[PDB]
Design a protein around this ligand. Structure first.
Ligand SMILES: Cc1ncc(COP(=O)(O)O)c(C=O)c1O
Ligand SMILES: Cc1ncc(COP(=O)(O)O)c(C=O)c1O
Lengths: 374, 368
């Protein structure tokens, strides 16, 4: 895209242009796309979530509901504020199950202050129900749409349903080319308070004056430039991601299950995923509450062999997220299970979904998979 | 100026993050380096790996930027601030006093090397050693500074460097955490990427952060390090020119003997004399405090601003900030005095001797 062009512009005009020009443009491009009225460009989605929780009023020992089937970066902010996480298993969309959410809220001795809802692999959660449950229980809804930029629910962009929404831009490898997150929200005052915290909580004075403490979370102009470049081709990439998903479905549909997106929703399919030897009757094996303890989850034989085989053909595939309710870090925390996230880890596979791939690449990969599973 | 070159290579496809860390090890001689999003993040990780917990006591420089002490707040630890000496850094005697009076042994000391000036390292290192206090050097503005030919940041168990100034929004970004213990630095590298165990899937025994620098900013970092020494020499030239043109009315305090300040920011004091140092000795329970700038300083800043020339007051000490209300601070009156009579001058390396001369003339005109 125009990444190099914009970065060159940043260095060339730094001496004369307005402050944070590309950061401003990046925020505006997200506002234009999502239709949110407020946007704040930060160093990461984790930082965006951290600020969202703080401006929402979350304090030490407060209760925060969160998805169990997710990446730990979505819930670590709860730990930063020393709040207590309550994890909820998922449904057929890979997202928080409505039944379990209601159960958790009903049984909480202390009322939860907020809910961090993850839209896993770009799939939309059942928003109408979740939004209502949060409203009726006075729970602040914070959408973790880190991998859901470009996803929609009934023509509305994921991230714009809760009081706060968060987007990420570069995947989750340990080291990435670029970096950055965007915090969006309904309340201008709260978002502007976050913009204040994002730069060390400075008062408007000639010198440095501080009434509170903040962070160093503001995005740089160089990364903002890359962000603008990425937003310019977002829709195109979303369309390509979906084409890739459909190709995988076409070539593997006979042996793998490709769970449908919610009706009247549009998943960005940022990463294509599939389940082997799966039947919907396997869902919701239980409905129990537990105190978390670490546990390993055995990969289905075909999945472990698949990853190994494709690995020898220079193709990288990965297991799905390992639920938070099975992680040692959250030992002792409350969790509500139905068995779905563990089942998905057991039979799921994350497939190569780079938009640079052609139909032949997807076909060749699929051919190698079919050969391995039989 | 290889920034654009390296960036292009990045796009043509963590190479540069690794090269950035290597360049810092090559320059500072530290055996361990970790590239992060900011110096604040680096200090945050240093404190955590150092073992700081909620309610632990952490000593810190009062005359500094809040970004250097905010991490204490992140871990809910308790700060104890210490005033400065003629180097702009922590006064050795006040440091000993604070340690002597502490109800319980402080876990660490965050020592700032203000405006690049070296602190009295031999004494401070010894004090921390004798009291089993972890020394963490905030060398955010001191990359290129040395004490007895040893790079600032390499005296403590941990050291932190920053790269792009304090503008509310900067072109680039980044920080570097260096340290003496490989295991501790590798633990920080672990925390910097969400505390992932080394395996195919995601497994976590602890929680971490997303503090790891991106490859693009790493590329910029490498380019900045390659010209660091040249920049420092120019910064020092600029400092000397200001001293030559303004030395009759402004005081430019000398760097410690056998030390080398990078003079990243040229600063000076008006109507100042060493005799007014250490005038008000006492300790307090912090309360917000307004400090009026010396009449000539405030006017100077105004005049230069009307000439499109930006100057700024020196850092306003933490012991005068509302955010730290209640916290303990040991003072001698120096950081407040420096704030009232100090000025931070334009220090861009692209400035020529004539440019500094012209700025100096406007300054002399302003103060009459
Ligand atoms: C579902 C999800 N939530 C949160 C995050 C955290 O975002 P970041 O990596 O930008 O800190 C990620 C990683 O991108 C993610 O995939
Ligand atoms: C003296 C000092 N300490 C700490 C910091 C914080 O560093 P960063 O802005 O990279 O988080 C700065 C800003 O550069 C600084 O000037």
């Amino acid at each position: 895209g125009n990444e190099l062009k914009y970065i060159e512009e940043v260095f060339k005009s730094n001496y004369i242009a307005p402050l944070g020009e590309f950061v401003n443009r990046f925020e505006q491009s997200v506002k234009d796309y999502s239709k949110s009225e407020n946007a704040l460009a930060l160093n990461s989605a984790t930082a965006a979530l951290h600020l969202a929780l703080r401006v929402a009023g979350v304090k030490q020992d407060d209760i925060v509901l969160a998805s169990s089937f997710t990446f730990i970066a979505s819930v670590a902010p709860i730990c930063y504020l020393k709040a207590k996480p309550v994890f909820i298993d998922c449904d057929e969309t890979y997202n928080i199950d409505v039944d379990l959410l209601k159960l958790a809220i009903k049984e909480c001795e202390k009322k939860p202050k907020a809910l961090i809802l993850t839209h896993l692999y770009g799939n939309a959660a059942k928003m109408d129900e979740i939004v209502e449950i949060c409203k009726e229980n006075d729970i602040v809804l914070i959408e973790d749409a880190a991998e859901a930029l470009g996803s929609f629910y009934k023509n509305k962009a994921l991230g714009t349903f809760g009081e706060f929404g968060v987007y990420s831009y570069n995947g989750n490898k340990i080291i990435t080319t670029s970096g950055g997150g965007m915090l969006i929200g309904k309340n201008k005052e709260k978002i502007e308070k976050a913009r204040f915290y994002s730069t060390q909580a400075r008062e408007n004075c000639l010198h440095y004056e501080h009434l509170d403490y903040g962070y160093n979370y503001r995005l740089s102009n160089v990364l903002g430039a890359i962000g603008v470049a990425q937003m310019e081709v977002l829709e195109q990439r979303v369309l390509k991601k979906r084409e890739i998903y459909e190709w995988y479905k076409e070539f593997l549909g006979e042996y793998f299950s490709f769970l449908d997106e919610l009706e009247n929703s549009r998943s960005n399919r940022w990463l294509s995923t599939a389940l082997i030897n799966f039947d919907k009757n396997e869902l919701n094996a239980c409905q129990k509450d537990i105190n978390i303890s670490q546990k390993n989850i055995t990969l289905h034989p075909k999945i472990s062999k698949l990853i190994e085989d494709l690995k020898n053909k220079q193709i990288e595939t990965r297991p799905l997220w390992k639920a938070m309710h099975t992680q040692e870090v959250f030992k002792g925390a409350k969790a509500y299970l139905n068995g779905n996230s563990e089942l998905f880890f057991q039979k799921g596979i994350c497939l190569p979904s780079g938009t640079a791939m052609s139909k032949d690449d997807v076909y060749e990969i699929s051919k190698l998979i079919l050969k391995s599973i039989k």
